[PDB]
Amino acid sequence: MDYHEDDKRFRREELCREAEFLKLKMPTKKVYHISETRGLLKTINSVLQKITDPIQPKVAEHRPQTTKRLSYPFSREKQHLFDLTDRDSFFDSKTRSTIVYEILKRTTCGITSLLANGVYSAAYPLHDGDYEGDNVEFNDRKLLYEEWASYGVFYKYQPIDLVRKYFGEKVGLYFAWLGAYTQMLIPASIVGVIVFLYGCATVDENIPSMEMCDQRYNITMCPLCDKTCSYWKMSSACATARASHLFDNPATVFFSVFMALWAATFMEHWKRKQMRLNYRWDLTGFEEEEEAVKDHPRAEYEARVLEKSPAYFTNLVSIIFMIAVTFAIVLGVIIYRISTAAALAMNSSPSVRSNIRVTVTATAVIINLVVIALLDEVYGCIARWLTKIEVPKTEKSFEERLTFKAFLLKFVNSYTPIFYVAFFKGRFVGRPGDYVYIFRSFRMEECAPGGCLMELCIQLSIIMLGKQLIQNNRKQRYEVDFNLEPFAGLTPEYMEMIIQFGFVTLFVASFPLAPLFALLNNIIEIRLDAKKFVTELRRPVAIRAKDIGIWYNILRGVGKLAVIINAFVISFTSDFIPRLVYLYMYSQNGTMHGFVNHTLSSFNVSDFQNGTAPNDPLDLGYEVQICRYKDYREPPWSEHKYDISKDFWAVLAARLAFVIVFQNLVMFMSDFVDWVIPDIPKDISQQIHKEKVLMVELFMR
Amino acid sequence: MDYHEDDKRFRREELCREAEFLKLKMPTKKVYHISETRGLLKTINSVLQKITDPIQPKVAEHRPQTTKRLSYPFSREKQHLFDLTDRDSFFDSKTRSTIVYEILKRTTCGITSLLANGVYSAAYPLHDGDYEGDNVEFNDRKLLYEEWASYGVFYKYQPIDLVRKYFGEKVGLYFAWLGAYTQMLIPASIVGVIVFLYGCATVDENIPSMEMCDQRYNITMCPLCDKTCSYWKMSSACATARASHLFDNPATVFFSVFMALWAATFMEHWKRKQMRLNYRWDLTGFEEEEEAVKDHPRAEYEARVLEKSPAYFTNLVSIIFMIAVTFAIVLGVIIYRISTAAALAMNSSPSVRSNIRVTVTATAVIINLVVIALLDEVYGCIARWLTKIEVPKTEKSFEERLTFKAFLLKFVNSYTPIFYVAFFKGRFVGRPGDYVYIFRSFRMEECAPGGCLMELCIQLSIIMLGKQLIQNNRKQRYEVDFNLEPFAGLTPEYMEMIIQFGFVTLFVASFPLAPLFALLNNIIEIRLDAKKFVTELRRPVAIRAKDIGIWYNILRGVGKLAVIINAFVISFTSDFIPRLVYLYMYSQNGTMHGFVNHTLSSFNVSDFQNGTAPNDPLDLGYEVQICRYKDYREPPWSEHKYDISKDFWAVLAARLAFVIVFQNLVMFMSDFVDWVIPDIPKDISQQIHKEKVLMVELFMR
């Protein structure tokens, strides 16, 4: 058991005597305010730190931390900058460790500089008691483990005031944002399941899927590979189109519009919720500028430049970063290409007889996720080094610059395969007359029969489900806390949820139940992070924070990019604008009977390109006279044959017109939602006005 | 001459005795603070109001107005909430009249309610001295008339601190914004004149204008009127295309991009300038909420509803307003249509022999401007009534709602003819096979030969120049100020400049010297408004104000709409995308030789529609065999004749693709400029931090 100390530091028991002097210079400056009690162990010794009530309100008034009054309006205890009450335990251990860390950070030799120097191994506050203990007397860590961090309490709300009071406003704000996100993902998931079930209802009776799954037509297609494979009927690969109707029905456009409205509504809902929490925790915004101490490399840089005495390297850093982002785009493209070219020769040596082309795609996206998870650490280390060579002035700007660089690298190498599949997958391959060969050897890529919307959708499925299946498959208190994992930070746990929000808002236009997978991951993730923070981590030092920070701007930017990416998905990969163009220009019946016959373009088989015909052209049981590819081109019985016809330009013009009207109308709807939903809630504004007039009443009397 | 009073009210000398009692109840409540001296005249009597130094710092401390200290950092007098100095004239007449108006507004029977009741005719402060006077002793009104309001001082900067100190922060902020706008219109005008001179340089050697002005081709066009007029060569109406190259060269696209960057830069420049002025005038932002008194109809409404006791009429008001805006769109369209159909029969009865089709267009746009200037008052009165029937709660929300409604009505009926000409002018008329007749009588409209870009450009010219040519073509001080014009408000003078900014930013894509006309109007308008405020108006009561208000949001919205309207202009009316499509798809030479032959589509003359041929088809001196219209259609020697060809869909697809890439890239550039240019200037942030640390130094010692 510990006695009632607040912070705790770790020595290194045994340059060496220079290190001992660098130690002893610090607490001899600390006894000016804070007591000490050096602990004892077997190999490496440790030291304690008890605050004194002489110095407690001195620092508690040095920075105004709004503590509770004695008078209360309408059963709610009012709060003021510093207050007076007996029973000297009204400073909880969170605030006590915050004060002692303020003294540890202000007292020079702060503590972070010598901690990076390596004279102290660790400096951490103490966990209140221990969870699952034998008759522990109302422990806050135990109460949080029982009511918040268990897995069988996933349905319940989370005690956000108690997790704030125990872990600090930063951890409380992360869990409040995660709770608001998982709560806003409920109507998203409901409408997504409704849309998917409507697709399942109309699969059996939509016409352009019956046109593909209908036999007795015998539509012979072109091989879509150079020399290995051969011709194939459109009647065979029709389960792909039958399942693609689930993902490109006319309700998924409604779900795209609804998801942009949902993203704007969630932005406003979290803004109002964090204003409410800033009311409930710290109404005052006295976190002023130029109070944070500069970096030690910043101090060395300014001392060196004033000694030997800067306007070009500060932008050369960003130039290097933009070159790295472009290289990361190209590297993600080629890593996905060699990933889908790695899972090959599946039928010769194993001969498992898949005959679904879903096993090979799942293997491709799984090993692509493996290589991306390997490159994540490299990109993070590169961003850290690339900020450390810039040496920013303050720690806030250092964290924000490192966060933005690591987010751009994670964004790029996480959404590059999906952007590649969704947009630039099978466009720039030519007709069967002349294919576009890259590096003169082999054709570029033709995406899977029935469209590569299905490839995109099962890629999103395997990503949003594999990020869950990879995990699913008597001692003293100070040394017990030493044996835990040090608290790294909230930046990767912010980053994973921002990447998931990007997945949802960017590709609901093709995957209408991405909010369902995100909600089923977040329900587990809230309790997993809760169990981690309670059991496996040292106590975070609990620094105050007003909002999330740069992550809200990142969220708003991803929500802005979601509109244009959804527009481009619905137009250029959903096969939804060709159906409207058929129905409203080339119908002659009012219905889309013959849409597949209008989409597929004929091809005289004798016009190949230097023996690129399949070596066995008899696989369908007959010699083929005309294969039918899919490119909106002129027939071979024409004056201008195989060139682009009028229908390609008509469909393309309608696609771009839909991008224009979708982007404009949906961005205006998002701006209108953000403008109608008010920034300041009525209850919070009325309560702060009432509290301020009651405070000036109390100070006038 | 007056003695040293501060405000001044006007009685009504003669229900009647009830009106006299309603008078006398007010100053008998005013002598609690402020002295009075009832004046004397011949017909209607007046009353004065001298403040007292007993009550002067009492109200000057009731609201903190930051007055100057005695200590100064770096030759700049520091300021604090209220200060102490002898020589009791350090409250200027502006602040003195502000204090007396605060008392007049707070003392019940405020003054505005009884002024609307009609018991006082006028309540105005007094002008310091008089301009152009015989040996006046350093008068501030005279100094402003000599250094700011003269016409021969147009080149000089304006004394913005002195016009603030004499007229209030609202008038100072209007003139500061107008000065920042006219100063930002200098590089705009320079680059616009450079673009126009580049067009004048390349007129003589561009190819598709030589193809039109070249004779010996004898391209016979179609009459573009139903029965009256006849065929005409493209060689005749080629001055129009020769002058249209000035307005649709490839440099005007650069000017559109530069004007969007200029609008974003001007937004950030004014934001920084008004933060600088808010530093220099009132650093404190204590203009709190719920301090403004409610409306008297609002008080009557709440009293009535509590007596007889609202969730539907508050939105029915906006429904009525949106119906009025749609009706105003349709009314502007039909007013411009009957305006261009009014100037007719010019050759029969007058027989002036114009032969330019610029006189009739100038007459059409002039009488359209006349009818729009008549409808402006109707729309303003309708917006005022439509807000008064809503009865908003506070005066700030009343002014903002009335301002937004009057701005939407002015926006609609000011930009409807130009939107109609630029976009929906000659699109929805058919081919010469079947024209689209409206109301079964006459064809819709075919815009002028050589494109109606020229009609749009001379319409913008006549608007932005006619708004300047319509104007270019011993007594006592209290009664002298009574004989002036009462200060109405800054709302129409804001509105005119916002409409001009809309003209500039929305149609620089076709008119590359609209900033030149706006600058030449603003140079006159600054000194005209200065001369008005100095000489012709009563002294405004000088209420403080932080920023412009809703006009900045209106400016930012117009700057956002400018991007998409410029994209649609450059694509769909500039004839710039057909030239790129020709040059990069149908060239066979690398140059655009034959662009007019590719644009014009043939037409067999014998296929008209029920005798809609011209009755004299021999005006060109020969019987015409094929007329050539301009619609990108198939020739009459075809299997599918007169229907839309492949080139129409190709050009339309490229047009929409240019709208997409222009809107996206240019909106990202505007967001990047707004994000790079910082909100808080370095000098102002450093000076407020230095002033605050010096203030806490002075109050700690």
Author numbering:
A (entry chain B), B (entry chain A): 117 to 130, 165 to 259, 267 to 466, 488 to 651, 683 to 910
What does the literature reporting this entry say, word for word?
Calcium-activated chloride channels (CACC) facilitate transmembrane anion conduction in response to the increase of the intracellular Ca2+ concentration. The most prominent CACC is formed by TMEM16A, which is expressed in different tissues of the human body. Structures of both functional branches have revealed the general architecture of the family. These proteins form homodimers with subunits containing ten membrane-spanning segments. Our study reveals the location of a hydrophobic gate at the intracellular entry to the neck that controls ion conduction in TMEM16A thereby contributing to the tight regulation of its open probability.
